[PDB]
Amino acid sequence: NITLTKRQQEFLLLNGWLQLQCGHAERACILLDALLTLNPEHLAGRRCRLVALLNNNQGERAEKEAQWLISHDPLQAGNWLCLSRAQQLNGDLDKARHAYQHYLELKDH
């Protein structure tokens, strides 16, 4: 049994974001996968890994992770923007356009 403390979860999250912000998308996914294995309910890590998967050209994993956030947090408009990009990387431009519309609608509330 393995656990991370609250400060350790944030330290692992900031390092995952650092690699993303600094253009190391795969390192971000590697670090944030470990974070979300030990705390799969960490939303900030879910969002960071999602955009990390997009920049790592992993549209398949990104689509499922965009769906996960749409399910467990449907109010956040940024979830549909991520689904739009993932479905775009997956070639389904029709779906990507529909997910982008819901992103525009949800931004206006």
Binding site: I2, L14, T37
Partner: protein, 67 residues
């Protein structure tokens, strides 16, 4: 322009932005070193590979006003 796609990339990276470094890194490596799953074993090897970059990582995070 009809659609603000020029702001899409900036919006994605804002969406991903979350709201002592040496000691914290050595502590996290300590915990991840015991995980047997592939995810923890992959991240433990990565954090060990970036060990020579701790000062650079702390400096960059400090400039980004995060750590």
């Amino acid at each position: 322009r009809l659609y603000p796609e020029r702001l899409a990339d900036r919006a994605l990276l804002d969406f991903a932005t979350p709201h002592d470094f040496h000691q914290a890194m050595q502590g996290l490596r300590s915990v991840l070193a015991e995980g047997q799953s592939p995810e923890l074993r992959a991240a433990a090897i990565l954090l060990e590979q970036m060990h020579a970059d701790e000062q650079l990582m702390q400096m960059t995070l400090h400039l980004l006003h995060k750590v």
